[PDB]
Write a protein that binds this ligand. Sequence first.
Ligand SMILES: COc1cccnc1CC(=O)N1CCC[C@H](C(N)=O)C1
Ligand SMILES: [Zn+2]
Length: 139
Amino acid sequence: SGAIYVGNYRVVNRHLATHNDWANLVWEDSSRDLLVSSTTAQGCDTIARCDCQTGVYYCSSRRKHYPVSFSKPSLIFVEASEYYPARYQSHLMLAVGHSEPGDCGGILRCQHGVVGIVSTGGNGLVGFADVRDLLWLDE
Ligand SMILES: COc1cccnc1CC(=O)N1CCC[C@H](C(N)=O)C1
Ligand SMILES: [Zn+2]
């Protein structure tokens, strides 16, 4: 679990969005596993606007943060799960690091701010949904 709170927006994994997220929907994209909903309170986070390929993510299955080197956002094949058919997920960045299904939502940060959230993984890999291209989150 996990979310990014920026301005009057809440960013979550689309597959973990709640009834309240869908009732306050701003934007969603199944191909990116992202959903953004509106909030009444002002957020606590800020978004990186950079090309960093190193950062630190929170891993809830170890209660710890780990440093990672991650690939640029790209179209990556993701196996079928209980939430999606087998498909290409876009704007996804892979890294070597521990992750389990419940780790989705953990934040990845670089020195400039929030880069993305855990969205996929397996066998010593962890994949993050990028949010740095969503310029409208800041306005
Ligand atoms: C962090 O997730 C891990 C980690 C290790 C092993 N299986 C997972 C789960 C996983 O990859 N997915 C299930 C939920 C939806 C995901 C998606 N974006 O399509 C795919
Ligand atoms: Zn950065």
